[PDB]
Design a protein around this ligand. Structure first.
Ligand SMILES: Cc1cc2nc3c(=O)[nH]c(=O)nc-3n(C[C@H](O)[C@H](O)[C@H](O)COP(=O)(O)O)c2cc1C
Ligand code: SF4
Ligand code: SF4
Ligand code: SF4
Ligand code: SF4
Ligand code: FES
Ligand code: FES
Ligand SMILES: [Mg+2]
Lengths: 230, 431, 62, 59, 217, 42
């Protein structure tokens, strides 16, 4: 049967094996996340989803930790806020200043989560990291200095598209996401990496520089290019 | 009561220093491979009880009850293989005990693997040895071949009806692959980035099977504990810290070495007895790192009266770690030494998760500026806060181990940092 | 520039409930098409499925 | 600090400073700025249309 | 500091997928022995040993060798590239005949490891990441090698030379370039990790079998 | 007599010593467990 957990003291009935992030979503709280995608596997590396359990001295990765009976999840606690601020601080410390020239622009998860969960000032007094851009076809434009090594594109590529030509090379702060060779990521499902990349590292090349998200009007229609009716 | 003065009749790791034969005949000249069949017939529950009574704690860093861990592994079979994984990726900066155990007591290591596998119900034992230890791995393979020929391992091991295999896996250079979950990942032919708990290795380990990771010294002292009692092993040591331990004394010392002593020998006595003391005398001591790079440093004041023990060093805002005693005398640059340690951590970071990755690179840069004073006094507390953000927010314990030396340096030698910054400010002002 | 002649081109209204929106549209006399809210189905996520002993869910990279 | 007639500046090299980021268009209270951009022949992020209506601008 | 080696591959005449490479039949037998050390359905676990064997055979790891290993193990070439780039013991670029690796961590830095490095640099006339013009020696800095009590030390082709002094390391380099093979181990008179002053432990003969065995067994 | 270093057999090993030792004790092994499939990709 369902077990009883608590989110900020509010009782929730969840199935065994449900994660902390899913319990908070069920109660109505969307925990900030970068590497977590519901359609993909659980990676738990960006560490942005760390939350505090009421009696646990250590924060837990909400996207990977299954809930136990009688767990009180403190979503808006001081420890959770400090953890989110620290993770955002590291991300933006190594992130480059490209927002005006970056197509992700006003629809960026890094920007929005920085404005909602991170600090507003920088303590980084050193130089930043620069990463050589790759070329993976005429559809996806890669500016890899903006990558946050969230491994969404790798996981999507392998699991969904059945193509394992993406991965991380090297280790440490020098880890780079790409192909390691001049190979184009050509597949019939290669725009979804543009969609799911939380930052502007992977962007649409035909759409490059043309518009900004706040200007666009969204019309909900269907697809006719095939018989799927997407 | 007093601790130390361990007797050669009670030292578990005989043949240390390689002064006796390391082959099967040499090991059998000592107590090795004695009544192993009787122990296996005693079975898993008896071995686990003996280990619990002995109270052996984890010898490869974080000291956990090995009896409790193996009891965790002692769940009933559910249609999957069972593995004991012996960690020999001795990448900790200061440790040579595992190398000595492998190179000089390979049959002790193999018998310990067999006993642990019998206690865990394990079909196989993968000894993951670091790739730099090529000669040690070859000696281990020679000993394994001798054991197989003698029938001590293989089907019907030691004539007990229990089938057990021992394999040796040579890793590449990765201090992160030293870690248990990263080691499991490296065995499976992946990059070697640590997993997230849960699932715990006792539930999902290498190949997805129940596998338990144990240190070389832990598995090597297991069969001696089984052959002997464990009341004796508990007698050697304090109440909650029992047994003998291998200490690697190195650095600014007269006679750097690796020795075996009681688990609560005072640090000053150990340095003055088994290593010839500090080079300029004990009055010339500056700092000591008692458990490898991960553990923080303690100054001479703490080292004067402290016991080389888990709880004793925890009460000293430090840890026992892997019992690697690095001694730094008064004529050294402590800031530069800690900067070199942080650079090591930056080089050895697997880079999977953001806090350790970015923060360790950031702290490397900050310390590189600190060692020349090219900073401001307001940045010391900023560095402390960065270390606190790194610590506890990472997948594996390398993030915590990369911030503890920084915290120790800030805690015990802040005046030195401020003095160096003031010196740099004065020098820049003059020009 | 992009000219227009439709006064209600930029007119978007917010309603808390489908019933409220339908009532407003009916009382104002416009025709209306109602589309039901699409909520994602609950999904079972497990970190340990990435290391399955005998299932295809095992991942080849991290 | 006087606000008068508008102008588009350049770097000393002669290259245009504007990068088609549309921040001015977004923040313009009177919606007096219209911007359309595309990749240039050398791949730069440069505008093709940058119109300001001085009868609509509030300066 | 920066490693100085890139983690992307650009095709060159000396390093391209068309570079001829294959295992010798003895190495194929070794691969067959290695592969069945892992459970059925987990052939991917042999990537590291097979790559190490390929590097031992060829002297370094070209992209052709990586692709051949991927074909042999039926694993993705990108996964093979991930492993090869992650692990630092794999030579993705040609190196000299003798790969001197000076350990420069704090336990070795406390002793004059800088003296060892300077002596090696002046003996060969190369920098800390270069190769001698005759393709004989390559010199690099490495992290802890597990011989801290025997600091300072270097590793030259899976052999440890410990307790080094500038004269000792210069003699080792001269002996290597002459053609002989020096004996690995401490050069200061010690045989192993024992204290130089003398054996402070294990000075009495070891006890025989069943010295303090329990009454139960 | 504990004055002679008896761990001198390791000044003979060659490039393929470890792998040859692994080959030699291949016959001493036992049948490996099977996951039921050729590869996780199958
Ligand atoms: C040789 C060796 C190296 C280790 N390296 C690391 C490391 O880099 N990071 C880490 O968090 N733990 C490291 N550990 C500790 C492991 O996480 C784990 O505690 C150990 O392998 C098994 O614990 P035990 O002492 O109970 O046997 C290491 C352990 C050993 C034996
Ligand atoms: S990815 Fe986001 S934070 Fe980075 S430059 Fe683009 S808009 Fe700015
Ligand atoms: S390129 Fe984008 S999707 Fe891929 S790891 Fe980097 S941030 Fe994530
Ligand atoms: S803490 Fe560092 S070494 Fe450990 S998983 Fe995270 S990135 Fe890797
Ligand atoms: S779009 Fe506007 S705000 Fe942005 S660079 Fe051009 S003139 Fe400046
Ligand atoms: S969302 Fe959980 S660690 Fe990334
Ligand atoms: S620090 Fe050099 S061998 Fe360990
Ligand atoms: Mg994107």
């Amino acid at each position: 049967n369902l077990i009883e957990v608590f989110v900020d003291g509010q009782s929730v009935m969840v199935e065994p094996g449900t994660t902390v992030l899913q319990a908070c979503e069920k109660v109505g709280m969307q925990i900030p996340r970068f590497c977590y995608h519901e359609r993909l596997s659980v990676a738990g590396n960006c560490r942005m989803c760390l939350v505090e359990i009421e009696k646990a001295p250590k924060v837990v990765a909400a996207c990977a930790m299954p809930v136990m009976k009688g767990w009180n999840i403190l979503t808006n606690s001081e420890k959770s806020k400090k953890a989110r601020e620290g993770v955002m601080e590291f991300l933006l410390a190594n992130h480059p200043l490209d927002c005006p020239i970056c197509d992700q622009g006003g629809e960026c998860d890094l920007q929005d989560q920085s404005m909602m969960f991170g600090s507003d000032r920088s303590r980084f007094l050193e130089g930043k990291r620069a990463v050589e851009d790759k070329n993976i076809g005429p559809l996806v434009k890669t500016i890899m200095t903006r990558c946050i090594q969230c491994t969404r594109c790798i996981r999507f590529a392998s699991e969904i598209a059945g193509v394992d030509d993406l991965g991380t090379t090297g280790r440490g702060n020098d880890m780079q996401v790409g192909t390691y060779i001049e190979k184009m990521f050509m597949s019939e499902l290669s725009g979804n990496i543009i969609d799911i990349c939380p930052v502007g590292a992977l962007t649409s090349k035909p759409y490059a520089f043309t518009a900004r998200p706040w200007e666009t009007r969204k019309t909900e229609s269907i697809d006719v290019m095939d018989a799927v009716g997407s | 009561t007093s601790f130390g003065s361990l007797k050669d009749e009670d030292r578990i790791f005989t043949n240390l220093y390689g002064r006796h034969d390391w082959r099967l005949k040499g090991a059998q000249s000592r107590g090795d491979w004695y009544k192993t069949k009787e122990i296996l017939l005693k079975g898993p529950d008896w071995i686990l009880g003996e280990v619990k009574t002995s109270g052996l704690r984890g010898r490869g860093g974080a000291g956990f009850p090995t009896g409790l861990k193996w009891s965790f592994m002692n769940k009933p079979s559910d249609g999957r293989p069972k593995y004991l994984v012996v960690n020999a990726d001795e990448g900790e900066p200061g440790t040579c005990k595992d190398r000595e155990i492998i190179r000089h007591d390979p049959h002790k290591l193999v018998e310990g693997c067999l006993v642990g596998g019998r206690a865990m119900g394990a079909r196989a034992a993968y000894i993951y040895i670091r790739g730099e230890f090529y000669n040690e791995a070859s000696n281990l393979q020679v000993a394994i071949r001798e054991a197989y020929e003698a029938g001590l391992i293989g089907k019907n091991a030691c004539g007990s009806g229990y089938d057990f295999d021992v394999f040796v896996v040579r890793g590449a250079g990765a201090y992160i692959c030293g870690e248990e979950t990263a080691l499991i990942e490296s065995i499976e032919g992946k990059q070697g980035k640590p997993r997230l708990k849960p699932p715990f290795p006792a539930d999902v380990g290498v190949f997805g099977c129940p596998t338990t990771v144990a240190n070389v010294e832990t598995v090597a002292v297991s069969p001696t504990i089984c052959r002997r009692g464990g009341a004796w092993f508990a007698s050697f040591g304090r109440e909650r810290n029992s047994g003998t331990k291998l200490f690697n004394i190195s650095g600014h010392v007269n006679h750097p070495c690796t020795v075996e002593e009681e688990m609560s020998v005072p640090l000053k006595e150990l340095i003055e007895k088994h290593a010839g003391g500090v080079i300029g005398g004990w009055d010339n001591l500056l700092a000591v790192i008692p458990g490898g790079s991960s553990t923080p440093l303690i100054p001479k004041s703490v080292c004067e009266t402290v016991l080389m023990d888990f709880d004793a060093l925890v009460q000293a805002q430090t840890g026992l770690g892997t019992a690697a005693v690095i001694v730094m005398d008064r004529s050294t640059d402590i800031v530069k030494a800690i900067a070199r340690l942080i650079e090591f951590y930056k080089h050895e970071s697997c880079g999977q998760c953001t806090p350790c990755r970015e923060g360790v690179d950031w702290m490397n840069k900050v310390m590189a500026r600190f060692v020349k004073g090219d900073a401001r006094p307001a940045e010391i507390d900023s560095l402390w806060e960065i270390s606190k953000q790194i610590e506890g927010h990472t997948i594996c314990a390398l993030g915590d181990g990369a911030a503890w030396p920084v915290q120790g340096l800030i805690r015990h030698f802040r005046p030195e940092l401020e003095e160096r910054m003031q010196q740099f400010a004065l020098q820049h002002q003059a020009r | 520039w992009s000219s227009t002649a439709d006064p209600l081109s930029n007119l978007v209204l917010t309603f808390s409930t489908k019933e409220d929106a339908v009532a407003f549209a009916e009382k104002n006399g416009w025709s209306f098409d109602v589309e039901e809210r699409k909520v994602p189905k609950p999904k079972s996520k497990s970190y340990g499925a990435n290391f399955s002993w005998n299932k295809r869910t095992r991942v080849s990279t991290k | 600090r006087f606000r008068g007639e508008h102008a588009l500046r350049r770097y000393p090299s002669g290259e245009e400073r504007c990068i088609a980021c549309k921040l001015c268009e977004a923040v313009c209270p009177a919606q007096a700025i219209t911007i359309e951009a595309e990749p240039r022949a050398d791949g730069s992020r440069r505008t093709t249309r940058y119109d300001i209506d001085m009868t609509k601008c509030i300066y | 500091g920066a490693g100085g080696a890139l983690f992307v591959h650009r095709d060159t005449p000396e390093n391209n997928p068309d570079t001829p490479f294959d295992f010798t039949p003895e190495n194929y037998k070794r691969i067959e022995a290695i592969v069945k050390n892992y459970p059925e359905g987990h052939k991917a676990a042999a990537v590291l040993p097979v790559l190490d064997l390929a590097q031992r055979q060829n002297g370094w790891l070209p992209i052709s060798a990586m692709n051949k290993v991927a074909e042999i193990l039926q694993v993705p070439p990108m996964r093979v590239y991930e492993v090869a780039t992650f692990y630092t013991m794999y030579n993705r670029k040609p190196v000299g005949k003798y790969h001197i690796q000076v350990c420069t961590t704090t336990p070795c830095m406390l002793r004059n490891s800088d003296s060892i490095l300077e002596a090696i640099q002046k003996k060969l006339g190369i920098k800390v990441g270069e190769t001698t013009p005759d393709k004989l020696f390559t010199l690099i800095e490495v992290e802890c090698l597990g011989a801290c009590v025997n600091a300072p030390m270097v590793q030259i082709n899976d052999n440890y030379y410990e307790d080094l002094t500038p004269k000792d390391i210069e003699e080792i380099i001269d002996e290597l370039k002459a053609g002989k093979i020096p004996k690995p181990g401490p050069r200061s008179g010690r045989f192993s990790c024992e204290p130089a002053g003398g054996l402070t432990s294990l000075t009495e003969p070891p006890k025989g079998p069943g010295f303090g065995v329990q009454a139960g067994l | 007599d504990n004055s002679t270093y008896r761990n001198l057999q390791h000044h003979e090993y060659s490039t393929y010593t470890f792998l040859d030792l692994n080959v030699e004790l291949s016959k001493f092994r036992m049948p490996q467990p099977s996951s039921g499939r050729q590869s996780p990709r199958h």
